[PDB]
From a paper:
The domains comprised in the 1–500 region of the protein are stabilized by crystal contacts in the crystallographic structure. The C-terminal region consists of a single helical domain that showed no detectable structural similarity to previously characterized proteins in Dali17, ECOD18, CATH19, and VAST20 searches and, therefore, constitutes a possible new fold. Contacts between mL-GDH180 subunits engage the ACT*2, ACT*3, and C-terminal domains. The ACT* domains of mL-GDH180 differ from the archetypal ACT fold in that strand β1 is located in the position usually occupied by strand β4, creating an ACT-like ββαββα topology with a β1β2β4β3 antiparallel sheet. Close to a dimer-like interface, the PAS module in mL-GDH180 adopts a typical fold, comprising a core five-stranded β-sheet usually involved in signal sensing, and displays up to 12% sequence identity with PAS domains in sensor histidine kinases retrieved in Dali17 searches. Similarly to S-GDHs50, the catalytic core of mL-GDH180 consists of subdomains SDI and SDII, with the active site located in a groove in-between.
Glutamate dehydrogenases (GDHs) are ubiquitous oligomeric enzymes that catalyze the reversible oxidative deamination of l-glutamate to 2-oxoglutarate, at the crossroad between the Krebs cycle and ammonium assimilation. Large glutamate dehydrogenases composed of 180 kDa subunits (L-GDHs180) contain long N- and C-terminal segments flanking the catalytic core. Intersubunit contacts in mL-GDH180 involve a C-terminal domain that we propose as a new fold and a flexible N-terminal segment comprising ACT-like and PAS-type domains that could act as metabolic sensors for allosteric regulation.
Residue numbers in the entry:
A (entry chain B): 629 to 1588
B (entry chain A): 1434 to 1588
Write the structure that this text describes.
């Protein structure tokens, strides 16, 4: 009967995968081939019995050959397909708990677990997870799909027992997107109860048992999961395979659990269950519950979304922390998101707010008094909108109920929201839809569900029936800015329509990222401290003390991530129109190589793409966020597959993931973390994408012709050499001080062209692969010495244009040193050639810089490089052409500098060196200079004229 | 030479005419042999073997296909042809700076590429890809020429 249970479980997994033949047909096929069924059982038994490993050579070939010969013998088509599918499931099984006999396991409670490789299963619909575990029982049935070794996701208590694998596979892509910025990749679990209790008619004892049955089945599902999962022991540091479990895969120990629509109060139960198996993660197994973070207190999600709101309003030109602004909100002062976010400014004027229970209408809200009443409501353990003081409500305002037949409309309520002038009463559904379409500065979301749709998306396709009567369209939203603290509030196509209608919006995975981020952060700290507890440095009682002491510092680190995330979003929004073509090739690469789905990711179709190209606009803000999320995942996949996380130059940033107390006290424990390679890769990709830009790495690969690994090498070297991160923080501080986003954004765009050019230079002129430490130690110090002295050798047109850019920057409040430091970026790029040249001729870099920039002055090279930059980048070949001409100019600059430094004496300055090189030229150089000045006189700057000017410069050199 | 001789042209004269654009390269060959005080035979061997590995004849023919409608485009096509020839001179200088005279053109090229950098392997790969595209406007030919130019330290 136990072998029959195994076959039945395989059939249930087959049903979840969507096998065509039904269960009746499947059992009939197994019945009509009893010899073949016996052969299948023999193959499985040979595969997974630990005693077989004690029985000599495993009877692999015997059982496998019996199965294959029985497969061949089949004539009937349905039988043949069914038995190959069965054989494929046997082959695909990676682990099983059929043979574990220790009493605490789930096998003892009649639960069977199959860890499978979905990648090799023929009948599985796409996408195929990296690993899957299927749990079968007569009471419970669950699945867990993981796209990677280090994965995170929520556990759905699903009610789709017919196909929950379908639900889990549907939600795994969105969960993975949520995890773009965090160390792990997407995972998702889900269980259904198959023996719910009989109902007593008593509305109370029934829900109690229904709850307790779900608790027992939740326990069963997780226990079956841990019967096959490996454990981590810090006694030796190695990964242990469950005893009496035969593993066909490698080693796989990381597994954490997050709450979902049915797993809200089960985190604590999950922590107890993880402890019963003796799992190493302890309380990090489940995010929060009883040891971890009180997310309502921290309010990390609200501040993470407030960073996006502030960035959007800054692009709007407003500052929330000092200027009154009007808000329409979803939720009440008793939830985490709404309550924590609506107290973040004392200038908040909450004009309207509906709930699940009540409606709040403040026609002319105050700021100080409205904030005080909002704070009073938040401090209560529980409250509703009926608890708002109705004396602090503005005249014409009030607290009304959503269960009323209708709600009267005050003249003050009507004018503020802006509807047809005749309304004097509305229905609660229409009041909610009008709140949803409001001429309001901010639209704050702290609820759950979808309330904004696209004009093209069907109502049933959204998957939210409860709000289906109140859902408005994205193009129909009149809010200036939309802040997304909640999940699934707006559909992707709805987000695209809102951005396309003039609204400011990001994706929800980028706004509410903070709460999940804190979940991951908490996990990686609970790991680290548990390791240090095992090493005897932290007494178990001070572990909790240390955790609570670091709450604020952990929150600040997550908010720093959100701010870097949002600043990059604003900058990407700035550069959308001119990079649409580059962005389009990126999308194609992802589709062709990473198995991306254009329509699923809400990425534009190619007809949609040049539709916008014909309109002269780039990607929308939610689409830009989506693209950068996939870029972050692809970059993590690229860097992790390499030895970059292994090398020390990339590993020098590891301690900075952890708070100050741990950074100081825990140093050896940080260096020997379990997730060291993954944390380093995630930090790496976050820094790279936030600093270098969306198209940096892809353009590097397009231009240079290397793999992502070489691009990363180059970015790290340039950031460490030029202090690029430090310049970025100085730019961001100026923008935070009140400098408009246009000035700081343009500062950053010049800086990113500089890094592009500099990274390309390092890749092009130094041997590959890059030794990042070597190039840093032979360039970064020299660069730091040469950057502050840009004023001593800029001459003529160079000096004039640099002064103009620095003064324009400082005219908007930018500090003078930073304005000048930014204005000279394209000359800091030439300092790389300056340093390389000084190294070749073993002479000082000061004099080399003097000659290089004086020569850049005599011929007016700045105008030529600017004209080159004006060359079109519409397609890849023209971009290649403009890149070829810029590099030709720079290389010719290198050869002419070599010849000029080959004449004269170091005491001769740039002007004297140039004078006596031209004094020692040939007819070729005088003719070239005369033609160059004539070219400058024409003012024509197409490919041909600039190219002939470059040849004139090239012929000035013997080595040509 | 065979097309010329098919119409009755004498064979020596047909071949002598058919090789005119390589007789032009013999000027650079002689100048180069003079600079390195080595015999012109071996210099010619290396120069034309190198013109063989990279398919330079197709690139010069494509350059000749550039328009001469106005003075500036004619100047541009002249610029690209001279850039190709000067880059030929610099690469020939570097290859003759490696190896030994007894090594023929193929052996000289083999051991210079055997002693290149990541820059040269990447440049060759991009050049072969350019040859594969078959696009021969100003921009593609120019980027092919920059690939050839970056193969030289003195650049």
């Amino acid at each position: 009967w136990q072998q029959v249970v195994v076959l039945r479980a395989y059939a249930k997994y087959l049903r979840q995968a969507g096998f065509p033949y039904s269960q009746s047909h499947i059992e009939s096929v197994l019945n009509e081939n009893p010899h073949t069924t016996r052969s299948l059982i023999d193959l499985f038994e040979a595969l997974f019995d630990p005693s077989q490993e004690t029985d000599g050579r495993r009877d692999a070939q015997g059982a496998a050959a019996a199965v294959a010969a029985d497969i061949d013998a089949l004539v009937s088509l349905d039988t043949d397909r069914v038995l190959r599918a069965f054989a494929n499931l046997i082959e695909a099984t990676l682990r099983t708990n059929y043979f574990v006999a220790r009493p605490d396991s789930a096998r003892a409670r009649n639960v069977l677990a199959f860890k499978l490789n979905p990648l090799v299963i023929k009948e599985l619909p796409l996408p195929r997870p990296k690993f899957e575990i299927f749990v079968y029982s007569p009471r419970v049935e669950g699945v867990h799909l993981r796209f990677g070794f280090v994965a995170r996701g929520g556990l759905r208590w699903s009610d789709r027992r017919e196909d929950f694998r379908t639900e889990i596979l549907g939600l795994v892509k969105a969960q993975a997107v949520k995890n773009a910025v965090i160390v792990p990749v997407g995972a998702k679990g889900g269980f259904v109860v198959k023996r719910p209790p009989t109902l007593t008619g008593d509305a109370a004892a029934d829900r109690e048992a229904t709850r307790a049955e779900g608790v027992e089945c939740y326990r069963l599902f997780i226990s079956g999961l841990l019967d096959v999962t490996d454990n981590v022991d810090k006694a030796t540091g190695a990964v242990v395979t469950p005893p009496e479990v035969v593993r066909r895969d490698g080693e796989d120990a990381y597994l954490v659990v997050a709450a979902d629509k049915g797993t809200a109060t089960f985190s604590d139960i999950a922590n107890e269950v993880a402890k019963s198996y003796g799992f190493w993660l302890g309380d990090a197994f489940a995010s929060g519950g009883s040891i971890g973070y009180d997310h309502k207190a921290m309010g990390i999600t609200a501040k993470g979304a407030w960073e996006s709101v502030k960035r959007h309003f800054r692009e709007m030109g407003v500052d929330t922390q000092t200027q009154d602004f009007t808000v329409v909100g979803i939720g009440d002062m008793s939830g985490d998101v709404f309550g924590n976010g609506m107290l973040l400014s004392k200038h908040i004027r909450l004009v309207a707010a509906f709930d699940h229970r009540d409606i709040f209408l403040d026609p002319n809200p105050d700021a100080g008094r409205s904030w005080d009443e909002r704070k009073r409501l938040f401090d209560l353990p529980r409250s509703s909108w009926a608890d708002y003081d109705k004396s602090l409500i503005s005249e014409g305002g009030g607290v009304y109920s959503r269960q009323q037949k209708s709600i009267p409309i005050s003249p003050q309520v009507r004018t503020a929201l802006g509807l047809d002038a005749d309304v004097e009463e509305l229905t609660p559904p229409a009041l909610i839809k009008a709140i949803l379409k409001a001429p309001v500065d901010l639209l704050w979301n702290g609820g759950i569900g979808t309330y904004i749709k696209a004009e093209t998306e069907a109502d049933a396709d959204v998957g939210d029936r409860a709000n289906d009567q109140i859902r408005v369209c994205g193009n129909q939203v009149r809010a200036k800015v939309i802040g997304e603290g909640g999940n699934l509030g707006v559909t992707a196509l709805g987000r695209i329509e809102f951005d396309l209608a003039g609204g400011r919006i990001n994706t929800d995975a980028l706004d509410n990222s903070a709460g999940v981020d804190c979940s991951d952060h908490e996990v990686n700290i609970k790991i680290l401290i548990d390791s240090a507890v095992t090493a005897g440095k932290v007494t178990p009682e001070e572990r909790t003390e240390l955790l609570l002491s670091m709450t604020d510092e952990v929150g600040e680190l997550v908010l720093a991530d959100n701010r870097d995330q949002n600043d990059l979003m604003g900058t990407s929004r700035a550069n959308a129109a001119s990079l649409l073509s580059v962005h389009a090739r990126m999308i194609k690469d992802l589709v062709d190589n990473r198995g991306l789905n254009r329509e699923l990711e809400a990425l534009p179709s190619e007809k949609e793409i040049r539709r916008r190209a014909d309109a002269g606009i780039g990607l929308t803000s939610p689409e830009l966020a989506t693209l950068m999320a996939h870029v972050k995942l692809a970059l993590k996949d690229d860097v992790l597959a390499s030895d970059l996380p292994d090398q020390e130059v990339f590993a020098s940033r590891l301690p900075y993931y952890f708070p100050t107390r741990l950074r100081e006290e825990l140093h050896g424990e940080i260096r020997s973390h379990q997730l060291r390679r993954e944390i380093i890769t995630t930090m790496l990709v976050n820094d790279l994408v936030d600093t270098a830009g969306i198209s940096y790495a892809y353009r590097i690969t397009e231009d240079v012709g290397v793999g992502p690994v070489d691009a990363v090498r180059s970015y790290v070297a340039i950031n460490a050499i030029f202090g690029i991160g430090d310049v970025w923080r100085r730019i961001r501080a100026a923008g935070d001080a009140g400098v408009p986003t246009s000035v700081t954004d343009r500062m950053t765009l010049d800086l990113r062209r500089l890094v592009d050019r500099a990274g390309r230079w390092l890749l092009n002129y130094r041997p590959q692969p890059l030794a990042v430490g070597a190039e840093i130690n032979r360039f970064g110090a020299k660069v730091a010495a040469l950057t502050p002295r840009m004023s001593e050798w800029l001459r003529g047109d160079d000096k004039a244009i640099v002064s103009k850019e620095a003064g324009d920057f400082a005219s908007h409040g930018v500090p003078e040193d930073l304005a000048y430091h930014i204005a000279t970026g394209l000359y800091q790029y030439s300092l790389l050639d300056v340093i390389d040249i000084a190294d070749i001729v073993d002479r000082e870099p000061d004099e080399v810089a003097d000659t290089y920039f004086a020569l850049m002055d005599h011929l007016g090279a700045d105008a030529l490089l600017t004209a080159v930059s004006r060359l079109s980048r519409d397609d890849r070949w023209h971009s290649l052409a403009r890149l070829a001409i810029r590099d030709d100019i720079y290389g010719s600059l290198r050869a002419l500098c070599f010849d000029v430094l080959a004449v004269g004496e170091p005491d001769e300055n740039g002007e004297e060196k140039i004078a006596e090189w031209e004094t020692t030229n040939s007819s070729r150089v005088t003719r070239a200079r005369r033609t160059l000045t004539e070219i400058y006189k024409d003012g024509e700057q197409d490919l041909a004229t600039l190219s002939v000017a470059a040849r004139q410069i090239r012929s000035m050199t013997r080595t040509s």
